Amino acid sequence: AVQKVVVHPLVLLSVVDHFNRIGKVGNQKRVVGVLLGSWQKKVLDVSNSFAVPFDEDDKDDSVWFLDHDYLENMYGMFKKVNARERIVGWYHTGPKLHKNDIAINELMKRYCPNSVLVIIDVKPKDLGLPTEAYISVEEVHDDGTPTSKTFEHVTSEIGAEEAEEVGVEHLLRDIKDTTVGTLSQRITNQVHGLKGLNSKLLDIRSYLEKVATGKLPINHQIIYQLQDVFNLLPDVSLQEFVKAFYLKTNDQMVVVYLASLIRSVVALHNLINNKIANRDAEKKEG
């Protein structure tokens, strides 16, 4: 297993360019490329990637072609340029994985036993996390269920290398928000958090509706981890919690009041100084 997959900005920019390059003329679904990177104790660092010519057929969901020799000699070239980059997975721009992806993941496993495929939804721009890292697992499913391939999910995040960091910061240079935050951006962060929580709850509710209506089978497991979500509610309005909450709210409110008083006194002093200055100028004019 893999604890994490940190994706550099270079690979997402490269997959964006690859999808734009292919779909500009070849209107097609997911475009497949290979993701290189460096390992760690357990966390993968995806650093560079390339595109492999791939074709697919919507019929039989198995008529596809991802080149073998192309992958091999792109890696030859990349290793010659930089030998630290190892094949660590592959990517496709399709928002959803296809029935076909199992074969491509096995083909990648032939090049890397712990191969992890990263879905990068280039077309949509949304709440966040445009990368989803998935790993193939194989087990008897413990609790006596028929076995299948399945793609276990591994968490992903977007990190950056110093050169990539300065590159991207200079690349934006027009919408980058202040890192200090300030009240407006903290409030917008809070609103964004509320929106994200609402979206996640809506997705979970849709999944639960699908399960209840029978359109999806009851997982019988992990669903009770969602039940664990339901149990973890803090249960506010408890007397001790209410008293502590009021105590800390007043502790913050007194500091807010002191700062507001400080600011008001400073503003009054500034206004007195300005009135004195303008009267001094008016009387000195004569």
Partner 1 sequence: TRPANHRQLTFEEIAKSAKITVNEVELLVMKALSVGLVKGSIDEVDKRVHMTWVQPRVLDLQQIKGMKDRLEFWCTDVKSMEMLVEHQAHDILT
Partner 2 sequence: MVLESTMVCVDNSEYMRNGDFLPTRLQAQQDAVNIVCHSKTRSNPENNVGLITLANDCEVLTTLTPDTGRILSKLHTVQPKGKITFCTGIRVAHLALKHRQGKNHKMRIIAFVGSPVEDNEKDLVKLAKRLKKEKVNVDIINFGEEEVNTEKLTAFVNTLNGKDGTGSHLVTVPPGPSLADALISSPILAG
Partner 3 sequence: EFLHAQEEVKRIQSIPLVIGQFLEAVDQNTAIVGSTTGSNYYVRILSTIDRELLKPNASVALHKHSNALV
Q: Which residues of 43-65 are buried (b: 16+ CB within 10 A; e: fewer)?
A: bbbbbbbbbbebebeeeeeeebe
* Smallest gap from residue 245 Cβ to partner 1 (A): 17
111 near partner 2, rule: CB under 8 A: no
109 near partner 2, rule: CB under 8 A: no
Residue 179 interface partner, choices partner 3, partner 1, partner 2, none, CB cut-off 5-8 Å depending on type: partner 3
Residue 180 interface partner, choices partner 1, partner 2, partner 3, none, CB cut-off 5-8 Å depending on type: partner 3
Among 77, 166, 202, 247, binds partner 1 (CB under 8 A): 202
Sequence-ordered strand ranges (E) for 78-121? 86-92, 116-120
What separation in angstroms does the CA of 208 have from each of 39, 212, 213, 233? 37, 6, 8, 19
Helix (H, G, I), strand (E, B) or coil at 224: helix
* Pairwise CA distance, residues 106 & 113, whole Å: 9
Among 17, 39, 42, 53, binds partner 2 (CB under 8 A): 53
Q: Which residues of 191-211 are buried (b: 16+ CB within 10 A; e: fewer)?
A: eeeeeeeeeeeeeeeeeeeee
Catalog residues that contact partner 3 under the rule CB under 8 A: 176, 178-180, 182
Tokens at 286, concatenated: 């004569």
Q: Which of residues 58-117 bind partner 1 (CB under 8 A)?
A: none
Phi, psi of 144, rounded to the nearest 5 degrees? 50, 65
* Smallest gap from residue 197 Cβ to partner 1 (A): 6
Residue 62 interface partner, choices partner 2, partner 3, partner 1, none, CB cut-off 5-8 Å depending on type: partner 2
242 near partner 1, rule: CB under 8 A: no
204 near partner 1, rule: CB under 8 A: yes
Q: Which is nearer to partner 2, 68 or 141 (CB)?
A: 68
Cβ 70 vs Cβ 50: under 8 Å = no
Tell me which stretch binds partner 1 (CB under 8 A): 75-83, 153-161, 217-225, 274-282. Answer: 217-225
77 near partner 2, rule: CB under 8 A: no
Strand order in the sheet with 131-136: 151-154, 131-136, 116-120, 86-92, 32-38, 44-51, 5-7, 156-158
54-73 footprint of partner 2 as x/- string (CB under 8 A):
-x-x-xx-xxxxxxxxx---
- To 10 degrees, what angle do helices 162-172 and 9-23 make? 60
Residue 274 interface partner, choices partner 1, partner 3, partner 2, none, CB cut-off 5-8 Å depending on type: none
| Closest C-alpha among 15, 8, 6, 46 to residue 161 | 8
224 near partner 2, rule: CB under 8 A: no
Interacting residues with partner 1 (CB under 8 A) = 183-184, 187-188, 190-191, 194-195, 197-198, 201-202, 204-205, 208-209, 211-212, 218, 220, 223-225, 227-228, 230-231, 233, 235
